[PDB]
Amino acid sequence: ADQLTEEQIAEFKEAFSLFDKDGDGTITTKELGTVMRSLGQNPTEAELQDMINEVDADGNGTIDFPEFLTMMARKMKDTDSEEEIREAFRVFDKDGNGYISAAELRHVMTNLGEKLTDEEVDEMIREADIDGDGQVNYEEFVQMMTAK
């Protein structure tokens, strides 16, 4: 599953073409960092090298278009990689009914990983049918997010 239809190739094409400068045909670390820097969020030089290690198995250090397309596309939208996501929650759940409380959920989301501000934490709640007590069923939340 690399596309459903050829329309999606246009979305992938300009996503690549935002990164590539001057038609050299492959994305180097300088180009990859440059788009993010112009937008206004700049990863570390170490992070950029870590990123272009895991992507690009040819191992030359410049990202090719079908390799990028393969990375973007993979299997389309799916209930993907569940054991990796699901067990990640299980390291840090509140109690043996399978939930995380909202106050702790905001504190981990704000201060770890990608570091959310409070409104986008509330947006996570807003996509799930939660009323009253504010306790999040992570296993169900993963089903809703990765629905197909």
Binding site: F19, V55, M71, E84, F89, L112, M145, T146
Partner: protein, 115 residues
């Protein structure tokens, strides 16, 4: 260099002895500093990279560039070229979230396993 000093006085200050004790083996909430502790940062990254992958809307500016195109339409003059190279931020977010997510899976696996 720096030391802590305390004062002790009186007799029979706490005669009752119903101090709590453990009569069995049960799970206790904790972080194992050597290894288990270092999984906090990747797990949060993996979860929040995945959320971006789902997201159709975010608190960030999507529609602002379309409002600038409406200001272009109000002027009476017409230009064949139109806007040039409009930066695609929503497309850019889609491109970086998948890379961040794939890296996050490897980082979760190289924090599940540690030295």
């Amino acid at each position: 260099m720096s030391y802590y000093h305390h004062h002790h006085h009186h007799d029979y200050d706490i005669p009752t002895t119903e101090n709590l004790y453990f009569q069995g083996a049960m799970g206790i909430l904790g972080s194992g500093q050597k290894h288990f502790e270092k999984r906090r940062n990747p797990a949060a990254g993996l979860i929040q990279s995945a959320w971006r992958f789902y997201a159709t809307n975010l608190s960030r500016t999507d529609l602002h560039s379309t409002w600038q195109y409406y200001e272009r339409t109000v002027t009476v003059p017409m230009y064949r070229g139109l806007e040039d190279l409009t930066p695609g931020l929503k497309v850019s977010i889609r491109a970086v979230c998948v890379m961040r997510f794939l890296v996050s899976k490897r980082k979760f696996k190289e924090s599940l396993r540690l030295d």
